[PDB]
Symmetry: C8
Subunit: 232 residues, 8 copies
C-alpha cells in the first residue's frame, strides 16, 4: 500500500541533436523530421516498459508497474510496501528500461553506419567504372580527330580560344597535341561528377559519426519518482 | 495448462538497411519509404503467424497459438503442457514463421534483381539504337556541309573558336576535314547522354547486390517468450 | 460436412515486376505505383472468385464457395463431402479463377501495347511534319540572307567563330555557301528534338515488351488449401 | 418466375486506350487520370441502366430490372418468364444500354474534337498576329541601326562573331546589309516560338484522331447473364 | 393523379468545351477544372428549378414540381391531371429553367469578357510606361558612354563581336555611333518583354471569343419526360 | 398575415470581375481564389441580414425577417400586413443590406489601395537606396582598375569583345576611359533589377484602379421576392 | 432587466493592411496568410473579452457580460438596470477590450521589429566576414598567377576578351597588372552577393515600418450596441 | 476557502522572436513554423503545471491547484486560505513553473548550439578534404597537359580568350606557365563551393547566438490571478 509516481515525455531536441544529425548524415533527405524522431523514442521506451511490467507480473510474487497517458505526456507507477520504497524500485526500473532501449538503439545505429559506409564505398567503385567508360570514349574521340587532323594537315593548334572541344572540333588542336594525348592515354585522369564527390563527402561524414552514451535519449522527466505521504 | 507470451514489433532500420538499399538501387524515388517497409515486414510476419495458428488447430490434437495487438506492437502467445514446453514451442513457431517469410522475401528480391537487370540491359540496347540514329544524322549533316564547303571552296578550317558546330557552320571546318569525317564515319563513336550513364550505373549496382540471411528481417522482440511461473486458470 | 480452407493475398512485387515495368514503358509517369497495382490484382481475383461462387450456386446441385477478409489478407473456403475432398476442388478453383483472370489481363495488356505502338508511330509522323516546317522556314531564312549577302557583296565567310547563325547573321556565311544551301535544299536533313527521340525510345521499348505466363500474377498463398481433420 | 444475374465492372485500361489517348491529345495534363476515366465510364452505364429499369416499369405490363453493388463491381438482374427468356432479355437490355451510352460518348467526343480543332486554328492566327508584331519591331530596330551605320560610315560588316545582334550592335552589320534587310522586309519570314509549334503539333494530332466503335467501352463482365437452373421463390 | 418523370445530370464536356475554353482564355491557370465546371452548371439548374417549384406553389391553384437526387444524377417530377399531360408541362418547364439559366450565364460571360478586355488594354498601357522608362535609362547610359568615348578618343567601333553592350562597354561602339543613337533617341523602338506579348496574345484571344446558344449547356438527359401508364 | 419569400446566392464571377482583379493587382498570388471570394461575399450579406432581422425585432412593434439555407443558396423571408406590403418591405430590406455592405466593401477596398500605393512607393525608395550602393561599389572597382591600368600603362581599350567587365578585367578598358568613368561618376545612372520594375508596374496598376458601384456585388437572385397569393396559416 | 446586444467579427483586410504588411517585411514568406491573421485577431479579442466578463463577476456586486458564436460572427451581451443603460456600459467595454488588445499587439510588434533589425544587422556582419574570406582567396589566387606570369614572361595582358578570369587564366592579365592588384590588395572592394543585398533591403524596410493606432484592428461591427425596447 | 483564477495562453511571436530565430539559424527550413512553436511552448508549461498540481497533493497537507481549457487558452486556479493568499500562491506557482521550464529550454538550446557548432566545424574539414582532392586532380590534368604542350612545342600562351580551360585545352597555356603551375602546386589555393560558404555562414551565426532570459517565453496572461471578493461555496 504505497504507490510512487513519475511523469515522462519525449526527449528534447538538444538531447537528441547528435542522433538526428547522424540520421541525416546517413539518410540525407530521407531522414525523419525531428518531431517524428521524438515521438518514436518515447514510444519505444513505453513499449519496453509495459513489457517489463508484464515480465514483473510473471514472478513467484508479482510486482505492479503501470504505464498510461497522463491525459500527451505519459504516466508510470509502481506499487511498494514502503514509501521510499516504491520510489527507488520505480527509479531502478525507469533506469533499466532506459538502458535496454539505449543499448539497442546504439547497436542499431552502428549497424546502420557500417552498412552505409559499405554501400558508399561500392557506389564510389561503380561510379568509377562509368567515369572510366567516359574517359575511354574520350580517347576514342581523340583517335578519330587525329585522322581528320592528319588529312586536313593541321599539325599545330588552330584555335585561339579556350572552351570545350567536341568530336567535330578536336582536330583544331592539331595532330601533334592529339598524338600526345593518345600516347599518354594511360595517365589521363578521370573526370568525376558532382554526384561522385557527394558520395565521397557523405562517406567522410559517415566515418566521422561517433556513437556514445550522449548520442541518443529516450525520454525526459516532467516529474521524477515521488515519495508518497499518504500510503494507498 | 501453461501459456507463454512474447511481445514483438517491426524490425529496426539498421536491421533492414540492406533490404532498404536494394529497393532503392532497383526502384529509385519509387522505392518505399523505410517506415512503410518496416510496417510491411511485420505485417507479413503477423499474417503468416495467424496462418500458423490455423494449421495448428486443423490438428488431430489442436494447439492454441495466438497473435494480438499488445496495447502498434504485438503480444503473441502459446498454450503449453509444461512451463518450458510452452516457452520452447512458441520460440520454435516464431522462428518457423520467421524462416518461412524470410525465404519468400529473399526469393522475391532475387527475382526482382534478375528482372531489373534484364530491363536495364534492354534499355541500353534500345538507347544505343537511338544514339546510332543521332550519329547517322550527324553524318548526314556533314555530307551536306561538304557540299557547301566545296561550292565555297573552303578547304581548310576557317574558324578559331572551339564550340560545337551546327548544320550551317560545319562547312567552316573546311572540305578536307569534312571529307575525312565522312571517310571514317564507320569508326566514329556514338555520343551517349547522361541518362544512358544513369542506366549503366543502375545496372552495375543491381549486379553488385548480394542477398544474404542478413539483408532482410521481419520482426524485433520487445519481450522474448516467457517461462510462466504459474499454471493456467 | 468437410470444409477446406486457404488464405491468399496480393502478389509480390518481384512476381509482378515485368507487368509493372510494362505499365511503365507504356504509361511512363502515368503508370500506377506498384502498391496500387497489387491492390488491384488481388482485388480483381477476389471479384472473379465470388462470381464463380455465384455460378457455383446456380447448379442442379449447388456447391458452396466463400470469400471474405481474413480479418488485409483474404480467406476462401470450399465445403466438401470428403476431406481431400473439399481440397482438390478448392485447389481446382483457385487455379481456375487464376487462369480466367490472367488470360484477361494478358489480352488487355497486349491490346494496350498495340494501341500504344500505333499512337507512337503517329506521334512520330506528325512531329516530322512540324520539323519539316521548321526546315522549310530555315531555307526561307537562307534565301533572304542570300539577298543581303549579294547586296553587301559578301561572297566568302566573314565569320571566324562557330556558334548559331540567326536570320540577321546568316549573310556572314557569304553568298557562295548560301547558294549552295539553297541548291541542296532537298537533301538538308531535318533537325529532330529531344521529344522526338523520346517518342522513338518508347516505341522501341514498347515493341520489345514480351507478354508471357510469368508476366502477371494475381495473388500469393499465405496458406494453401488445408486437408481438414475434424469434419464440420 | 425466373431471374437472371450478371456481374459487371469498369472497362479495362486496354479497352479504353484510345479514348484515354484522345482525351490527352485534347486536354494535356488536364486530361483525366485513367482510373477516374474507368469509374466515370461504368457510372455512366450504371445510371443509364437504372433509367432503363424505370421505363421498363412505366409499362403496361411492368418488367423487373435491377442494378446494385455486388459486395466496387455491380450485380445486375432481370425477372424472366422462363430461364432462357430472363437470360436473353437481360443480355439485350445490357447491350441496349451499352449501345445508347456509346453513341452518346462518341458524339460528344467528336464534338470535342471539332471544337478543339477550331480553337487551335484560332490560337494560330492570333499567335501569328504577335509574331508579325515582333517582326515589325525588328524591322524598326534595323531602320534605326541603318541611321547609326550611316552616321558612323560603317558600310560593310565589322563583326566576325555570329551571335544574334541587338538594337545597339545591329549597325555593326554595316549599312549595305541593313539597307538590304529593309528593302526586302516584305519577304522576311516570321520567327515562331516553341509554343507556336506545340499548337501546330496538337492540331495535327487532333486531326489524326479517328473515332470508331473500339475507341470507347463502358463496362466489363465479371459474370455474363446466367440461365438460372431453378425457378423463383 | 398523373406523374411524369425525367432524370437529368451534368452537361457533357463536349457540350461545354467552348465555355470551358472561354473560361481558360479569360482566367488562364485560374480557370476552374472542367469537372468543377460541370458540377456547377447542373447545380445551378437545380437551384433555379426548386425556385420555380416554389413559384409554382404560390398560385391561385398550385402545381407540384419536385427535384431530388436520383439516389449523383438528379430526379425531377411533375404531377398532372392527364397523362401527357404531366409530360408536356414538365417538358415545358425543364426548357424554361434551361432558358433562364442560359440567358444569365451568357450575360455574365459577356460581362466577364468586356471587363477582361478592358483590364488587358490597361495592362498593356502601364507596361508600356515601364518599357518607356527602360528605354529612357538606356538613352542616359548612351549619353554617358559618349563622354567616355570622346575622352578615350574612340570614334569608330572597337568591338569585333556582337553580343550585349552594357554601361561600361557601350563606349567601345565609338563616339560616332553613340552620337547617332542620341540624335535619334526619339525614334528608338521600345523593347517589349515576353509578358507584354502574352498580354497581347490573351487580348487577341479574348476579342475572338464568340458567345452563342451553343456555348453553354446546363444538364443532359438520362431519361426524357415519361408518359405514365398507371395514373397515381 | 402575409409572407414574402426570395432565394438568393453568391454573386456571379462576371459580376465581381472588377473586385477580383483589384485583389489581384494588390495581392498577386496571395489574392483569394474567386470562388472563395463569392462565398465570402454572400456570407457577408447573409450575416448583415441576420443582424437586420435582430434590429427589426428590437422594435416597439417587432417585424419578422428570416434567413435560412434553401435546401448552398439561401431562402429569405418577411411577414407583411398585406401581399404587396410583404413583397415591398422584403425588397427594401434586401436592398438596404445590399447597400450597407457595399459601402463597407468599397471603403475597405479604397483603404487597401491607398495603403498599397504607400508601401509600394516606399519599396521603391528603399530599393533605390540599394541600387545606389551597387553603383557606389561599381565606382570603387573602377577606381581600383584605374590603378592597375596605370601601373600596366594600358591607356586605350585592349579588348574587342563586348561582355560586361569585372573587377579584374575592367583595367582592359584602359586608363582614359576609366578616368572618364570616375570623373562623371555623379551622372552615371543606377541599374535597376526586374524586381524594381515589377514594383513600378504594380504601383501603376494600383493607381489605375477605379472603384465604382459596379466593382463589387454581394448576391444574386435565384428568385425575387414573391407576392404571395394566399394569406398565412 | 435590460439587455443590450451587439454583433462583432474579424477585422477587414484594408483595416489590417499595414499589420499584414509589417508581418511580411519582417517574416517574408513565413508571414501568415491574411485570413489566418484575421481569424487570430478577433479570436484574441474574444479571449480578452470572456476574461473581462470573469473579472466582471468577481466584484462586490457582479455584472453580467456574455460572448458566444452568433451561430461565424460572434455575439456579445451586457445586462443593464436601465435601457441605455446596458448600452453605454457594453460600448464602454468593447472599447476597453479593444484597447488592451491593441496596446499589447503594438508592443509585441515593436519588440518583433527591434529584434529583426538586430538580427539583420548581425546577418550583414557575418556575411561580410565570408565575403572578406572570398576576397582573401582571390588575392591568393592572384599571388599565384603572378608566379606563372613571371615565369612565362607575360608582363602585359594577352587576353583580348572580357569575361571572368579563373586561377588558371589570371596569368594572362600579365605580371604588371597582377603586381598592381597585390600592391593595392587593401583597397579591393568586397563583392557582395544577391542575398547580402536582400538582407540590406529588408533591413531598410524594417527600419521604415511605423506602428500607429491605425496599424492593427481586432474586430468590426456587424451590429453596434442596441438600445433595448422591451426590458427582459 | 478562497479560489484565485487566471487565464493564460501561448507566448506572442514578438516575445519569442529570439528563440524562433535561433531555431532557424540552427535548422534552416527544418526549423518549426512559429505558431507550432508557440503551441509547443504553452503545452510544455501546461504539462509542468499539471505535474505541480500533483506534487502539491502528495503533501502532508494537500493544496488544490488546477489547469483546464478556458472555453485554446487555459483557465488556471488555486484554493487559498484567504483572498490575498490564494492570489499570492497561484502567482508564485505560475512563476515557479515558468522558471523551471525556462531553465530547461535554455539549457537544451545551448546544448543544441554547442552540437551544431561541432557538426559544422566537422562538415568544414570533411569538405576541405574533398576540395583538396579536386585540387589534386587539377594538378594531375596540368601535368598531363604539360606533356601535350611539350610534344607540340607550345611554350607560350596560344589563347586570347579568358574562360576556364579543361583537360584538353590546358596545353594552350603553353609549357612555361604549366611548368610553373606544377612547381608551385603546393601553394595553390583550394577552390571552395557555395555550399562550403553556406556552412561557414551558418557556423558564424551559430556562434553569434546569445541565450538570455529574454530569448524564450512559455506563456502570456489573458488574465492575471484574481483576488476573489467572495469566499468559496
Amino acid at each position: 500500500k504505497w504507490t510512487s509516481t513519475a511523469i515522462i515525455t519525449q526527449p528534447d531536441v538538444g538531447q537528441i541533436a547528435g542522433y538526428n544529425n547522424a540520421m541525416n548524415v546517413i539518410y540525407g533527405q530521407a531522414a525523419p523530421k525531428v518531431s517524428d524522431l521524438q515521438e518514436t523514442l518515447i514510444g519505444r521506451f513505453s513499449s519496453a516498459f509495459s513489457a517489463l511490467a508484464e515480465t514483473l507480473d510473471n514472478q513467484e510474487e508479482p510486482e505492479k508497474l503501470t504505464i498510461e497517458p497522463s491525459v500527451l505526456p505519459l504516466t508510470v507507477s509502481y506499487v511498494g510496501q514502503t514509501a521510499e520504497g516504491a520510489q527507488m524500485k520505480l527509479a531502478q526500473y525507469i533506469q533499466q528500461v532506459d538502458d535496454k532501449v539505449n543499448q539497442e538503439l546504439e547497436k542499431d545505429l552502428k549497424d546502420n553506419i557500417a552498412l552505409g559506409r559499405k554501400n558508399l564505398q561500392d557506389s564510389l567503385r561503380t561510379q568509377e567504372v562509368v567515369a572510366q567508360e567516359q574517359k575511354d570514349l574520350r580517347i576514342r574521340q581523340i583517335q578519330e580527330a587525329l585522322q581528320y587532323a592528319n588529312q586536313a594537315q593541321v599539325t599545330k593548334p588552330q584555335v585561339q580560344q579556350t572552351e570545350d572541344v567536341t568530336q567535330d572540333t578536336l582536330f583544331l588542336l592539331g595532330s601533334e597535341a592529339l598524338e600526345s594525348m593518345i600516347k599518354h592515354e594511360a595517365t589521363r585522369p578521370l573526370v568525376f561528377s558532382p554526384n561522385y564527390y557527394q558520395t565521397k563527402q557523405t562517406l567522410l561524414d559517415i566515418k566521422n559519426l561517433k556513437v556514445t552514451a550522449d548520442t541518443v535519449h529516450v525520454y525526459r522527466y516532467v516529474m521524477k519518482p515521488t515519495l508518497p505521504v499518504r500510503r494507498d
